[PDB]
């Protein structure tokens, strides 16, 4: 059985509305993790109960090279804890905020790993991810992609079945999600088009701080590219950012397989992608187990952490928070 006392709390990696992620050491083993700690009372107040449970469920039910692995999830009277593998390289958002643009080769590597994982989710797990963005893409010690945050996932979506929840991130929303008239798994390829456009072009494909103006652009404005972008990347992003999901690269029965076969990925051996046989073009340059240079100072320089059967409305006992991954 796992409690909070089993960990030493080292560095704050990030902080938000619902809680925090702390770099931790498991006392018994000496292993390092990222522990996401959420307040139950804030979860309930903001109606995030069902999404928390989905995060938990998808984490426990997934095993893939480019999906964040969960070691433990447990709970206290007022907290929910997910002990995840520590992705040393931080968010792709961290990197892109600084380098501004990635090379096409580097974006191809990241795109190939994102597709491999979304392919796995759609095909093996009948899951749609729905929140693809730079914040949810992390790099591991070797420079490989880790997708995080599965709370907006949709389970039990086979082939062409549809979803109706209006959700995601405003900047990244697919036109059919904004149309609010049912959507399929191809919303993930829109998201893929957005993040790859950001990597190769240095900006969002559509932006405006006023959401009403933002949503207008995503719905109405044809996709444009910086004129330095090469022809095979222009071809990929145009296909992914087709506003009609039936026209979208990946929008048909073949799904990811359509994207995998596009000329932009021409010499990608998709099995080698799965097997991590492709060498990452950037290896995180950390100097110790606790080096957090790829996390904002705003967090890392701060301070960290601030009844076993209580089941109340403000602090519910959550099911399936008794998890420890089998070896």
């Amino acid at each position: 059985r796992v409690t909070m006392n089993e960990f030493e709390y080292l560095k704050l990696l990030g902080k938000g509305t619902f809680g925090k992620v702390i770099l931790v050491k498991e006392k018994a083993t000496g292993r390092y993790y990222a522990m996401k700690i959420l307040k139950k009372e804030v979860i309930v107040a903001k109606d995030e109960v069902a999404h928390t449970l989905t995060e938990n469920r998808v984490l426990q039910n997934s095993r893939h090279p480019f999906l964040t692995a969960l070691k433990y999830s447990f709970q206290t009277h007022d907290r929910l804890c997910f002990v995840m593998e520590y992705a040393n390289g931080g968010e792709l958002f961290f990197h892109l905020s600084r380098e501004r643009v990635f090379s096409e080769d580097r974006a191809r590597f990241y795109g190939a790993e994102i597709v491999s994982a979304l392919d796995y989710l759609h095909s093996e797990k009948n899951v749609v991810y729905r929140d693809l963005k730079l914040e949810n893409l992390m790099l591991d010690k070797d420079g490989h992609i880790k997708i995080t945050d599965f709370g907006l996932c949709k389970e039990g979506i086979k082939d062409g079945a549809t979803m109706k929840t209006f959700c995601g991130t405003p900047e990244y929303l697919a036109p059919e999600v904004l149309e609010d008239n049912d959507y399929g798994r191809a919303v993930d390829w829109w998201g893929l088009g957005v993040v790859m456009y950001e990597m190769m072009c240095g900006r969002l494909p559509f932006y405006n701080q006023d959401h009403e103006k933002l949503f207008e652009l995503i719905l109405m404005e044809e996709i444009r590219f910086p004129r330095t972008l090469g022809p095979e990347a222009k071809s990929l992003l145009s296909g992914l950012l087709k506003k009609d999901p039936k026209q979208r690269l990946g929008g048909g029965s073949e799904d990811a397989k359509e994207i995998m076969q596009h000329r932009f990925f021409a010499g990608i051996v998709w099995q080698h992608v799965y097997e991590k046989k492709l060498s990452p073009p950037f290896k995180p340059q950390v100097t110790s187990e606790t080096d957090t240079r790829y996390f904002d100072e705003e967090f890392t320089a701060q301070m960290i952490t601030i009844m076993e059967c209580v089941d109340s409305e403000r602090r519910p006992h959550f099911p399936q928070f008794d998890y420890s991954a089998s070896s």
Binding site: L96, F166, C167, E171, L204
Partner: peptide, 10 residues
């Protein structure tokens, strides 16, 4: 660059 974005559901 762009500010951090926030996930939502309604």
């Amino acid at each position: 660059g762009r500010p951090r974005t926030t996930s939502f559901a309604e």
